[PDB]
């Protein structure tokens, strides 16, 4: 019996959780995903891997899920685990809306989930979720927000970041090309198509190889919108 | 409700009236109060008809598992021990009464009484609300060593008496004779109930 | 591939590099431990199951060394392989029949019985702690609708309908001969079963060395043919 | 449930999982504290400047109550768990005693918790060392260090995280009653300490401040850099 | 009591090796094919039938889940029976709770979840089946493919099991968006017919159709008719 | 790899042997029993001047008459100390009397072989306590010092040295101890042996000292008292 | 090497190595010898002293008015199983209002120690007991072992070097039904002293004697108490 | 190897733990029973391992119920545990069904119980065989022999332990269908004195029992006079 236990909740001889870092390898092989935090809105841009075949595209997007009235999340890596995490986040935020009669801020939601991923990473011996998540959501305390969480349960707020394939080149291009507090929504669109153009080595970028959904404010209500294909071709053509 | 059983040499005879009344208006004027628990073990229901039915069904289930697992017909003593256990374990929740009767290779005909969760073999084990009106008749007309026709006409007479006096009992009188050959289900229509002093 | 093996694939029910389950396949190697061979075939009127019966010790009470097991008043059963596992599936199958009768108010059809039992062997072929019950249970029963029924469930969870079959060491030659006869067409049926089995064994059986079960349309109750009647069919075989 | 014994002795008497967790702390972002006359300062190294980064949500210096705050280092998620449990337990203490928790109470609590997960079924030890600083109701300053092994201590000023050897050497050399006579000498003590280990001292490992009977006070990054030029 | 730790652990490369292997098992399964027409969906799967002894009408691979949903698989049979009973359970819970036929995207979400739960739970292997769920409602066709890893893809037309690569390349050149249902069935049966190896009959290939009238299996007579003209 | 409940080829649990080796790394503590009461002195082994000396408390109170010295995994002994405290106080509540030392060391000694990895209804203890305690106290039977170890065996001892240098020191205990010894002689003697064994130069900071006398409750000697006793060196 | 890690692994020879290694524990324990006469059931224990200053660990444990034990091996296991035995006897004198017969007691202990000897991840009790008990059937001396087996003995000696004591007890077992109390205890002390190294000697310290019989509830005699019984022994 | 737990078939399909446990039964001392016209008899080659043990130590003839006897072998503690399980079985059957349990159903239940431990790595097989005897006016004498695998077979003559083969060759010398208990007892005695390898493992006891007509179906150990006349005759047949 003890021969069979993989012991997924133990440290190494140098203090590195092998399952969490191997998971970071898996998400390391996932499709790149990046969003940017701006003043007038927030956009997410994810390389799709449903590229192109006899797929049907029955859904509105691939890696963008809607979490409450006021938030959106992008996963990367293990698709199924991303499903479980999304369902769990919806359950959390709706329990907060039951128990407080207001939307849940992004920080509280991310912490509630990241306590879960940490919980698997610590005991129970289950494998950790190999699914990194980028969040976007508005709240009346702190404004537009971007939260990156990873399999280890650690998370942080960012102004624009990229997770997945070529994440290093993506964050590099953001460091070279992000104007803090001065990026507009359209400036964010242009930069995002810049980074995704340079990173995605499959080679000529199409409207089919990515999707982008943007969140802004409109009349005391938050709008979570995905970009139609015409706008994507328009913005890539503009990028040319 | 007036169910009755009798023990004779080759087997038994389980008479029973065929009315179930709701208060003062009847709900069912034909209802077989003899549901088989096995091929040759009938239980005469009474009291809470729903409760009696649930007990007959659960008892039939256990008696069938125990029946097949031994690969031999379950003795009536077994059956009245399972219906006795299920009638005793729930006695605060079931107003049931099940004069379980039958046949078996090892003992021949039997009629066990199981009111309130007890177990007592008896020659004739009458029950039901109408049974409180025929103790006189059965005591005056029961002689041990009854041939089968004597048992059948006997219980028909007795339940006839109970039906004439009791309001909780009316309709037809079912009779089954359980022996080594098998069960012989019979019915007594209201035009055939032997007439007694009517005034 | 081609017999490749990695880690604990050869120890528990997990997929080897090829995709096989070595524990289930070994279990099929385990039905050959009993050293027996059983057969069931069905004609339009009845379904007959004939088996070996090896009583070597002479102290064995021959009344209890039997692979026929009355499952209900209408459902036959012939085990094969390891013995005690066969006993256990007989108890579980009997419990299934009594429970179907209690909850659903009628005799469990053979298809739903053998389906259910196959569902209870699959659970062994998926969980990692318990092994698969090494015993291929064959059933025979007369449904009022489809008629004579013979279904074979094995440690792999499979099961199917059969116009004939065989289980045990000589399943190969048995099924070969039954091919050679079904392609050449059932009233006697029993003559077919004993002819096939005695052929693949080449024994010229004696009336005590085997057993026979029959469930006929005219007689739903599963029943066992004694050594006298099996003597009748055998002697009816020798005299042609 | 998973009930394997993860933490078990080895053939020297060592608990290898504990030594490994302390390994994880030794790669944590270096933190330091000091205990002054009426002030208690904590410094958390830099951690991850990353110009796109958000400052507020990547700090290591959370509040445990009105009078109890804590740094840490190592597996930051785990420390988020311990911080959470300690907060709920502080409030349960105010429910059952009406008195705010002494620093000894909450620290000995968390030390108990870390000790339990060092010694239970299917649970790895926490990879966090927490330097909980706070003020007893009498107002005395309090520094308690808690490591994954669960053993805790009072401290004058102790450093945790990577390179805590050299920094602890620093406070061994420079902690004097002249050093903590005033506020600014105290804070220039802390930042003067980490500056041996904080790349480009000035605006990296910003800090935190708590005054007697005053809620936690935090930088003030520009004010970190004033001290930066003041020491560099 | 049973093993509580996951048996599927991230290999040092980070790709879940058990799901690679399980996908190899489905890759060896009997070939299946599904194509979505404009008004419905076809399901046709190859019977890897051994000896003629088999009562072929005894069990079917294309089982209905409600009046409007189907299933075909590729790989391990008994595992498939598990997922079928689970799916019937789920659609029935949905029908009790909301009083509506379960939309197929939903059912594939839940059954995809159940296929995921065993890539992570204690001491269970992942499934070894790749489902094809075809469904009709809102006047629209649906065809999803769930894998052992739990993820589900929405497809126009697909193929799985033995030789699924040549199957998919066969569909890329032969699927057109305006294909009516019967000509769809013709295209699928041709697709299997590319690598059948055994001279298909109305006994050894199954055909399922889901249209506005609901889902059902085509009796071997009708399937024999479609096996005409080929 | 093997379990926690495995017996070696010699007949001892592995985890109790490796644990009793783990106690060998702890700081040496020593206490001595006399007809006047029992004393307890333990080396703190301060690691850095930045530490608070009053932080390391290896001689803690279990009740008004039972002082519990320890040595080894100081973290583990917290569950033992709290166990004993809850025990003696529940004993006082129920039975309205102080609890004997043998009763306490026996109770708290029941949680030493209570470890496993398959029964585990809670997440119960997954390894033996890496603690060697020395419950000292006085009752109606008078002064008594009960050793205890990870293996759960609690034994009455006249005077015992436990920890890193406990062997040599124990040789000093059999060398110096005699039944008619007076308690101040006990304090002086034990401090002499610790001064023999300690690596660092002895002082009144990196040790502690407690005693429990027939009329005196448990008491920890402060700095000045320790210095006054170390004036004899 | 690959069979000696678990209790639930049958060797190729059909033995459970962990159980045998468990009996090695009682074989290392300090020697304790019991025996019985027509009327008395005597125990005799050498209380090991770890250090010269340390006191000899107790080997005898009151179980009830008529039953006493003598452990040898893992002590904490001994107090666990002793707590179980005590709970049994108290429950019997509670419900049935009569002292538990001894043989039923050692049967309960047998089924108790048998459970972990067959379930994975448990370990056999490494405590080997002698139980003395008087009831209506006369005095009793049961031996129990890590294998959960129990014995009914005329006189048995467990502990390190116990084989000598069992040798002597074979030399003189035929006399034990007739011996009075004192002569009996003399036999026990002699056979127990057969185990120790030659130079070292029985004293009032390292010996304990718990006697129980017809007219006597079970009673344990400590260091000064064995004086009367601890005399002569040439 | 491939033999580290029962839940692991070898490449040839043999749960090595059950076979090993059978090798544990085969190292123990042989016990035999013989069903005959009117009941069943049991002998027990109960090797006494030292002169210290009481006459009657380590009995291997139990009483799982008043109409059923039980002779065991092998690792004896496991035999006791089967005693508790079986006793709970017959008790449960008398409380459920109100009469003495048919022995056949009792060896079904117990056989499923032993079999319950050859499927999991979490537990090991019972390393012990045993025989059950019973007599009743309704079914006569019956003898079932569970082994570590859990399989239940009815025997006219049985033998379990180390000298099983020689005891079988001895049992086949009998017309046990045509003998009564009081004559069976002698022959079982002769069997145990013959099969016992004397020069190796000397000093056993003979511990007999029957259940049948003369005991009114009540399983009880043999009278000492009958056991001693039996040993006398069997030893005389050795000569």
Author numbering:
A (entry chain O): 2 to 241
B (entry chain F): 1 to 199
C (entry chain R): 2 to 186, 191 to 245
D (entry chain N): 2 to 233
E (entry chain P): 3 to 232
F (entry chain M): 9 to 241
G (entry chain L): 4 to 237
H (entry chain Q): 6 to 244
Direct quotes from the study:
To identify the binding site of the compound, we used high-resolution cryo-electron microscopy and single-particle analysis to determine the structure of the human immunoproteasome in complex with PKS21004 (See Experimental methods). The final cryo-EM 3D map had a resolution of 3.8 Å in which the secondary structures such as β-strands and α-helices were very well resolved. We were able to unambiguously assign the density in the substrate-binding cleft near the active site of β5i to PKS21004. No additional densities were observed in the active site of any other β-subunits or in any of the α− subunits. This result is consistent with the conclusion that PKS21004 specifically inhibits the activity of the β5 subunits. PKS21004 is largely hydrophobic and interacted with β5i and β6 primarily via hydrophobic contacts. The inhibitor also formed two hydrogen bonds, one between the R3 group and Ser27 of β5i, and the other between R3 and Asp125 of β6. However, among the human β5i residues interacting with PKS21004, many are different from their corresponding residues in the human β5c. The side chain of Met45 is swung outward as compared to the apo human β5c or β5c in complex with CFZ to accommodate the bulky R1 group in β5i. Kinetic analysis indicated that PKS21004 inhibits β5i and β5c noncompetitively with substrate.
